[PDB]
Amino acid sequence: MKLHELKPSEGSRKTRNRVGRGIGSGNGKTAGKGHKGQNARSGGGVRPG
């Protein structure tokens, strides 16, 4: 591997979902959490079981 041409493997790297930037990305305004619902607010969330 010449350090110029340093390309990764076939499908081992993948971009993080940058959540909450702009409308047209998907998941911009509500940032995937949803609407009015315990779960959409900050700080969780409820106990697991």
Binding site: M1, K2, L3, L6, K7, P8, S9, E10
Partner: protein, 205 residues
Amino acid sequence: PKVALYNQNGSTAGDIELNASVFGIEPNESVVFDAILMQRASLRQGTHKVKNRSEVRGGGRKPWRQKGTGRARQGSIRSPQWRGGGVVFGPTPRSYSYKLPKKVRRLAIKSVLSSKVIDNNIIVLEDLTLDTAKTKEMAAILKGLSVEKKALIVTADANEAVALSARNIPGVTVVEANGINVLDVVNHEKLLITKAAVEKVEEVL
């Protein structure tokens, strides 16, 4: 690998015979790639720190009241919404080292050495005898062995003769016998070895 030996001047008749299991592997193109990247990482120091919202030395009383003036709610002075700061998440100092398995870790250096044999770039420098320790000796040898750029020198002894030279030579790096590693070989394009270190490296691994 039946590469002809070098007299460091001659240079020279007589060829050496290397291990197929070390210098004759089809190089793994994506197992090498993982190993540069853990090598570049953790050379970074990780000393980036941000005074967080609590951690900012700041008065915590509310500036004005809750409800009753023509303003907003505006809880603390030193928050995230204010001029004073600071960053919400921020970078905190942290780690970057992590160890690959040795069945990878061998097969990285087993790959890149085997790759550079095919690309006609190993020049085995027998016995590396230097009669003084000035850098002008290594000026002539590298140019006399017709190499120009960044270069590695594998000394099986960690010589005071070799290593005091050639470091002021701005591209060439003098390496420990054990001290071979992937960001030295990939970076410096070419590596010069004693006859004794090929005995050593093929019986390191």
